[PDB]
Amino acid sequence: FQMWLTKLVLNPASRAARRDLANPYEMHRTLSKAVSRALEEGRERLLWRLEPARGLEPPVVLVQTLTEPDWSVLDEGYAQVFPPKPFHPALKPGQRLRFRLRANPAKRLAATGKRVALKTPAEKVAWLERRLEEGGFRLLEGERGPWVQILQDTFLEVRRLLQVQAVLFEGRLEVVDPERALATLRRGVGPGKALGLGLLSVAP
């Protein structure tokens, strides 16, 4: 009952990689090949993120899995694989952590039956603040506001036409219920998980 973290540095010379970078869905299809069996048996929850462009490059993909992934499944010259290290999120109560999460802060309109994305940063943060509090976490805060900052906010138009509002949060949170917290990390947070959203990364 642990997890696995993999760091994939994608080779931009690879046409297979360049395709998966353009198409979040085609990236999910590729990634799920490495945990193909446990998915078939419905005992896997695959979560991943494309880490924010820094350089200089090169593109980095962080991949979280419940089962040990077999990265020999990738195309030759697709990515430089780093050994999947057994991740145990040893969580004690009241523990505080830096976090990163690219998520989809939205809401199901009942007037249309559709799931539209929230507009203002004030209501985007309110979504995160709710979602973490549901999941055994709690956003830290100073007398100015919550301890979070939105870094990216892009509208993904994935062809497969999938349309999703991708929002990158980064801030600080406390652990209230360590059991609820662990489960949240395992599940991920909010929609668009097959698009590279949901993975809540935490570090001390």
The tally of domains found in the chain comes to 2
Domain containing 186 equals 90-204
Q: Of the candidates 89, 114, 139, which is a domain's last residue? A: 89
Burial class (CB in 10 A: 0-12, 13-18, 19+), 163: exposed
Same domain, 157 and 75: no
Q: Of the candidates 89, 115, 148, which is a domain's last residue? A: 89
CA distance 12 to 18: 6
Query: Token pair for residue 23?
Result: 């198409």
Sign of CA dihedral 169, 173, 176, 181: positive
Q: Of the candidates 89, 116, 150, which is a domain's last residue? A: 89
Give the C-alpha distances (Å, rounded to integers) separating 56 from 12, 52, 53, 60: 12, 12, 8, 12
CA distance 97 to 147: 11
Q: In 10-23, which positions are buried (b, 16+ CB within 10 angstroms) versus exposed (e)?
A: bbeebebbeebbeb
CA distance 41 to 4: 18
DSSP code string of 43-109: ----EEEEPPP-SS---EEEEEESS---GGGSPTTSEEEEEEEEE-----TT-EEEEEEEE--EEE-
